[PDB]
C-alpha cells in the first residue's frame, strides 16, 4: 500500500496472529518425538536413498523454512548444539509454550514491556532457585560402572533395545585415554565402518584404524617415512592410437621400456631420499606391483578423500601431484606402523603415543550402511555427554521430576509481590508443564491423570512417569535408585537460551518491510 509491494502480510495486526502461528506450526512437527519411542521419519533430499531418522537435528538440518520467526530459533538451536552435547527440542518446546501463553495475555489487553519484565523476573528467580535440587554426584572417574551407568542412561534416550554393550564399549574407549581431569579432547576418537557381521561382534583398538589392503611386504621398521600423494599412479605418459587394428611392435616396446625406466628412476629417487613406503591414490599396474614387490615397498589399494584429509590434518604433510620426481618434504612423526588381520581384512596400526594426546578408534560393524548411522550418533552423543569439564557433575533427577518442583516454587513465589507482574509469573510457571505432557501423550495414555497423580503424591521431586504399562496410570516410581539423571549445566543453558529467544521474539514485533535494490 505504502511500503510493502503485495508480498508479505505484516502490519498493525499480525502481532498476536501471524507471528505466533508460524512458530506453533514449526513446533507442532516436533512434539511427536522427545522420549524413548519408535517414531522414525523418512528423509528424502539429494542422496536418493530413503533413510529414516529419529533425532530432530537431522530433521531440522534438511528442512528449508522461509520465515524470520522460524529462523530466529535455529540460531539458538545451533548455539546450544555447539555449547553442550544434547539439548535441542527443549528450547523449542519452551519457546512454543511461552508464545502460546503470551498470546492470551496479548489478546486480553496488556503491553509487551510488562510481560517481558515478568518473564525476566521469573527467569532470574528460576536461575537463583536452580542450584538447590542436587542429589547424586560423581565420585571417582577411574572406575567402570560409575560412568557406564551414565552412558547407559544417555543411550536409553536414543536406542531402547541394545544399550549396555555400546555403553560399555564407549566407557572402555574413554577410560583408555584420559579422564575429565586435566585435559581431554573430542576430535581424537574416530569411528570406522566395516561391512561384515552384525553389531554383536564389535571390539576396541587403540591407534589409527584403516581398511587398506597391502600387496607388497610387511614393513615393521621405524625408518619407513610416510609420503602422501594425490594421484601418483595416474598417467605420466599419454598414449594414443595410430591405426585401427594394431601399430608396429617396435614403437610400443620402446614406449613401454621408456615408461618402465622412468617409473624405476622415480621409485629409486623416492626410496633413496628417505621414504621406504609411499601412499598412492590411483590405479594399479602389473609392472607397478612387480616393482613394489621386488623393491620391498608397501603398496596400498583403497583410496578415499576422507583418509587423505585425516592424514593431512593429523600429521601435517602435503600431497605433491607432480610428474617430475620432487624432494622429500613430508617428514612427519609416525614411525611404528604395523599390520593386523581383522575379519580376514588387512588393517594398519600406528603407534606414536607418549602418554599425552592419545587417540582411539572403535571397530564398528553392521548389516547395511543405513544402520550404523544411528550407532555413530549415539556414540558421539555419549562422548559429548561424558565431557563436562568438572570433577563433580552434580546430577539432578531429570525426566520431569524437577520441572514440576520448579513450577510450584515459581507459583509460590509469585503469590507475594503485588502489582501487574503476577500474570507473567503464573504463565512462566504454567509453561513448565509441557515436558510431562509430551512424554505421557507419546506413550499411549492421557496426560491429565498423570499430572494429577504427580501433583497429588508429594513435593519430593523424585517421582516421574515410567515407560512400562505398569507405570503409566499410577506413575509412582523413584528414579533416584534406578539411575535416571540429567545434566545440571545443560538444563540451565537450555533455559537461558529459551528465555533469550523468547525475549528476542517478543521484542522485534511490528512491521516487516523489504529493502530497496
Amino acid at each position: 500500500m505504502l511500503k510493502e509491494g503485495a508480498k508479505h502480510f505484516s502490519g498493525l495486526e499480525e502481532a498476536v496472529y501471524r507471528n505466533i502461528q508460524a512458530c506453533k506450526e514449526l513446533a507442532q512437527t516436533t512434539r511427536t518425538a522427545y522420549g524413548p519411542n519408535g517414531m522414525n521419519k523418512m528423509v528424502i533430499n539429494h542422496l536418493e536413498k530413503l533413510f529414516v531418522t529419529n533425532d530432530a537435528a537431522t530433521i531440522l538440518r534438511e528442512l528449508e523454512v522461509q520465515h524470520p520467526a522460524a529462523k530466529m530459533i535455529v540460531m539458538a538451536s545451533h548455539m546450544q548444539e555447539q555449547e553442550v552435547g544434547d539439548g535441542t527440542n527443549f528450547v523449542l518446546v519452551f519457546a512454543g509454550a511461552l508464545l502460546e501463553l503470551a498470546e492470551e495475555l496479548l489478546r486480553i489487553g496488556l503491553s509487551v514491556s510488562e510481560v517481558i519484565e515478568g518473564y525476566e523476573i521469573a527467569c532470574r528467580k528460576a536461575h537463583e532457585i536452580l542450584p538447590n535440587l542436587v542429589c547424586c554426584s560423581a565420585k571417582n572417574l577411574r572406575d567402570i560402572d560409575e560412568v557406564s551407568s551414565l552412558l547407559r542412561t544417555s543411550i536409553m534416550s536414543k536406542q531402547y533395545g541394545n544399550e549396555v554393550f555400546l555403553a560399555k564399549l564407549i566407557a572402555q574407549a574413554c577410560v583408555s585415554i584420559f579422564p575429565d581431569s586435566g585435559h581431554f579432547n573430542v576430535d581424537n576418537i574416530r569411528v570406522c565402518k566395516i561391512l561384515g557381521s552384525g553389531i554383536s561382534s564389535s571390539s576396541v583398538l587403540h591407534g589409527m584404524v584403516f581398511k587398506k589392503e597391502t600387496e607388497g611386504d610387511v614393513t615393521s621398521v621405524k625408518d619407513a617415512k610416510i609420503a602422501v600423494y594425490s594421484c601418483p599412479f595416474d598417467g605420466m605418459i599419454t598414449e594414443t592410437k595410430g591405426t585401427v587394428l594394431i601399430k608396429t611392435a617396435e614403437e610400443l616396446m620402446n614406449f613401454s621400456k621408456g615408461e618402465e625406466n622412468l617409473m624405476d628412476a622415480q621409485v629409486k629417487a623416492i626410496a633413496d631420499t628417505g621414504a621406504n613406503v609411499v601412499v598412492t591414490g590411483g590405479k594399479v599396474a602389473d609392472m607397478a606391483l612387480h616393482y613394489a614387490n621386488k623393491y620391498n615397498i608397501m603398496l596400498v589399494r583403497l583410496n578415499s578423500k576422507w583418509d587423505l584429509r585425516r592424514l593431512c590434518k593429523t600429521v601435517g604433510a602435503t600431497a605433491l601431484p607432480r610428474l617430475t620426481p620432487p624432494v622429500l618434504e613430508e617428514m612427519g612423526h609416525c614411525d611404528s606402523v604395523y599390520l593386523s588381520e581383522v575379519g580376514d581384512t588387512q588393517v594398519v596400526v600406528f603407534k606414536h603415543e607418549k602418554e599425552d594426546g592419545a587417540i582411539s578408534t572403535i571397530v564398528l560393524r553392521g548389516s547395511t550402511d543405513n544402520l550404523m548411522d544411528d550407532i555413530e550418533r549415539a556414540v558421539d552423543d555419549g562422548v559429548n555427554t561424558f565431557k563436562v569439564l568438572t570433577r563433580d557433575k552434580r546430577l539432578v533427577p531429570g525426566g520431569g521430576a524437577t520441572e514440576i518442583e520448579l513450577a510450584k516454587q515459581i507459583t509460590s513465589y509469585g503469590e507475594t509481590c503485588p502489582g501487574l507482574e503476577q500474570y507473567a509469573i503464573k504463565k512462566f510457571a504454567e509453561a513448565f508443564e509441557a515436558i510431562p505432557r509430551a512424554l505421557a501423550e507419546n506413550s499411549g495414555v492421557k496426560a491429565n491423570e498423570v499430572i494429577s497423580k504427580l501433583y497429588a503424591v508429594h513435593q519430593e521431586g523424585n517421582k516421574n512417569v515410567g515407560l512400562d504399562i505398569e507405570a503409566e496410570v499410577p506413575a509412582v516410581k523413584d528414579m533416584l535408585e534406578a539411575g535416571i539423571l540429567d545434566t545440571y549445566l545443560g538444563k540451565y543453558w537450555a533455559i537461558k537460551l529459551a528465555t533469550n529467544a523468547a525475549v528476542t521474539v517478543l521484542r522485534v514485533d511490528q512491521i516487516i518491510m523489504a529493502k530497496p535494490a
Partner: protein
C-alpha cells in the same frame, strides 16, 4: 492533460498522514524495534530514523521526496531526523482543515512564519548556561545510549566514551572524530569492551615464542622486496630459456642476502644489547631461515601489513617511508614504549602503547558473532556525536517535553500582536507542538489527555519546566533528574519543519508530462 481542482492538496495531505502514521512508534526509549530482510535473507535490526529512511521501499513519489529531503538535512547536526514528521503532519492537517473551512495559504504561511519567529525568540530568551564537567557529559552519554541501546550495558560504554573524550580533548581548538578507530572482533560473550591507548596490529609473526617484554623499541616503515615469493619471475612476461631466469633468481637471492646483512649490521650498530628492540613492518613475506637469524640477535620483523596500519603508524609517530635498507639517519625511526602480544583466535594481535604524543585511542568491542555488533557500533557513534555536540557550546536546555508546553503557552497567551488573520495561523502552529508529550504518554502505557491536563495544571500552578515521567505518569521536574538536550538541534529542527511546511501549500496543479 487539463486539470483545475484541489485534488493535489488532498492527495498530498493523505500521503503526509500516511507517512506520519507509518513512522510514529519509534519515539522514546520504550519504543518497538523493527526488522528488514530482502537481500538473500539478511536479518538486520535497527531503530534509528535516518538508517530506516535510507533503506526502505516507498511506493509513493511524494513520500519518497519528503524522506529524501528529511535525510538530506541530517548532515548538519547530530541526530535530528526523528521526531519531525509528526509536527509536519499536524501542521499540514491544520492547514488542510483551515483551507476546507475557507482561507488563503498566504495568511497561513505568514502566521506560521510569525509563530516560528516567536518560538525562536522564546528559545533564545529561555536558554541558560552551565559549567561543563564530568557528570553532565556522563548523563548526556547515558541518555544517548538509553535512547538507542537497552538499559543493560549503558555503563561501560559511556564510561569508555568519557575516558576517550578526556584523553583526546586537551587543547582549545575543536576536536576531530578522525583519530578514533572503532574495531570489531569475534568472541563468545556479549558485554566485552576495551579502551586501548595505543595502536592495534592485526598480523604478527609466523614463528612466535621468542620475546615480548620489549620496552624501548625502534620502528621503521619501508616497502622494499624482502621476500615476496620463491617462484621464478622476470618482467611480467614468460620466456623460453631457463638460464636467464635462474640467474635472475640467484641475483635476487644475493640482493636479499645483502639487504638482511645490511639490516643486521644496522641493528648491531644502533643497539648491541637486548633492551633496545627493533621492530620492522613489511607487507611482503618473511623467510623462516632468515627470520631465525634475525631473531637470534634481537630484531623482530612482521609480515603482511595493511596500508591503514602503516599510515596510522607514520601519522602517530612520524617516520619517513623509504624504499631502501641503507644506513641512514635514525631520525625517521619511531619510538615505542610498550609492546604486547595478545593470543586469541587464529591470529595474534599486537598492541603498542607508551609512545610519544598519545593521540590514538581504540575502542575495541566484542559481540556474540551476529549483526548486533553493527547496531552497537552505530549506537556508540551516535553517543560520540552527541558528546561532541554537547562540548562545542556552553548552554544546555532541559528536555523531556518541557520546552513545547512553555512555547505553546507563550504563543497562545502572550500574543505578539492583535490580529485575527495572524491568530488563525498562530493557533494552528501552537496546537501542533503538543504532538511529542501525547505520543510519549501513549507509548509509555498511560492515557493521553489526563497526563496532558495534569502537566498543564502543574505548569500553571508552579511555573517551572515540568517534564514527562515514563514510570508512573506523574508530572515531575526534568531539571533535577538528569535529562538534558542540545541547543542548535531544536533550531535546526524548527527551521527544517518550517521550510517543509512552507513549500507544500503553494502546490497548484500536478500535470502528467516530462520525458527525462
Amino acid at each position: 492533460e487539463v486539470a483545475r481542482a484541489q485534488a493535489a492538496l488532498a492527495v498530498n495531505i493523505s500521503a503526509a498522514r500516511g507517512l506520519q502514521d507509518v513512522l510514529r512508534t519509534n519515539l522514546g526509549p520504550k519504543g518497538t524495534m523493527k526488522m528488514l530482510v530482502s537481500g538473500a535473507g539478511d536479518i538486520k535490526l535497527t531503530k534509528d530514523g535516518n538508517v530506516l529512511l535510507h533503506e526502505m521501499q516507498i511506493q509513493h513519489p511524494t513520500a519518497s521526496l519528503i524522506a529524501k529531503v528529511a535525510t538530506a538535512q541530517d548532515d548538519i547536526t547530530g541526530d535530528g531526523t526523528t521526531s519531525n514528521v509528526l509536527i509536519i503532519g499536524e501542521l499540514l492537517k491544520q492547514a488542510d482543515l483551515y483551507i476546507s473551512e475557507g482561507l488563503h495559504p498566504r495568511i497561513i504561511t505568514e502566521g506560521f512564519e510569525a509563530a516560528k519567529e516567536k518560538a525562536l525568540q522564546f528559545l533564545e530568551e529561555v536558554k541558560v548556561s552551565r559549567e561543563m564537567d564530568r557528570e553532565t557529559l556522563i548523563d548526556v552519554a547515558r541518555t544517548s545510549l538509553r535512547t538507542k541501546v537497552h538499559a543493560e550495558l549503558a555503563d561501560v560504554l559511556t564510561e569508555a566514551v568519557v575516558d576517550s573524550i578526556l584523553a583526546i580533548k586537551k587543547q582549545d581548538e575543536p576536536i576531530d572524530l578522525f583519530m578514533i578507530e572503532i574495531m570489531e572482533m569475534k568472541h563468545k560473550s556479549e558485554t566485552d569492551t576495551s579502551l586501548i591507548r595505543g595502536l592495534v596490529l592485526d598480523h604478527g609473526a609466523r614463528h612466535p615464542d621468542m620475546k615480548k617484554r620489549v620496552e624501548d623499541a625502534y620502528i621503521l616503515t619501508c616497502n622494499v622486496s624482502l621476500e615476496y615469493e620463491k617462484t621464478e619471475v622476470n618482467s611480467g612476461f614468460f620466456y623460453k630459456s631457463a638460464e636467464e631466469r635462474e640467474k635472475l633468481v640467484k641475483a635476487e637471492r644475493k640482493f636479499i642476502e645483502d639487504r638482511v646483512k645490511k639490516i643486521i649490521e644496522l641493528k648491531r650498530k644502533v643497539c648491541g644489547d637486548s633492551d633496545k628492540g627493533f621492530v620492522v613492518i613489511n607487507q611482503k613475506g618473511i623467510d623462516p631461515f632468515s627470520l631465525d637469524a634475525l631473531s637470534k640477535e634481537g630484531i623482530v620483523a612482521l609480515r603482511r601489513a595493511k596500508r591503514r596500519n602503516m599510515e596510522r603508524l607514520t601519522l602517530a609517530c612520524g617516520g619517513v617511508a623509504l624504499n631502501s635498507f641503507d644506513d641512514l639517519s635514525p631520525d625517521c625511526l619511531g619510538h615505542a614504549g610498550l609492546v604486547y602480544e595478545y593470543t586469541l583466535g587464529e591470529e595474534k594481535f599486537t598492541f603498542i602503547e607508551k609512545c610519544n604524543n598519545p593521540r590514538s585511542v581504540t575502542l575495541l568491542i566484542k559481540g556474540p558473532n551476529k549483526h548486533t555488533l553493527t547496531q552497537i557500533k552505530d549506537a556508540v557513534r551516535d553517543g560520540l556525536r552527541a558528546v561532541k555536540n554537547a562540548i562545542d557550546d556552553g548552554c544546555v536546555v532541559p528536555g523531556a517535553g518541557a520546552v513545547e508546553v512553555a512555547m505553546a503557552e507563550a504563543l497562545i497567551k502572550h500574543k505578539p500582536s492583535v490580529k485575527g488573520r495572524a491568530q488563525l495561523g498562530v493557533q494552528a502552529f501552537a496546537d501542533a507542538l503538543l504532538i511529542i508529550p501525547k505520543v510519549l504518554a501513549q507509548n509509555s502505557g498511560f492515557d493521553l489527555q489526563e497526563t496532558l491536563v495534569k502537566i498543564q495544571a502543574e505548569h500553571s500552578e508552579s511555573g517551572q519546566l515540568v517534564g514527562v515521567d515514563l514510570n508512573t505518569g506523574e508530572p515531575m521536574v526534568a531539571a533535577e533528574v538528569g535529562v538534558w538536550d542540545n541547543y542548535c538541534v531544536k533550531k535546526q529542527l524548527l527551521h527544517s519543519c518550517t521550510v517543509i511546511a512552507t513549500n507544500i501549500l503553494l502546490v497548484d496543479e500536478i500535470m502528467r508530462a516530462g520525458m527525462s
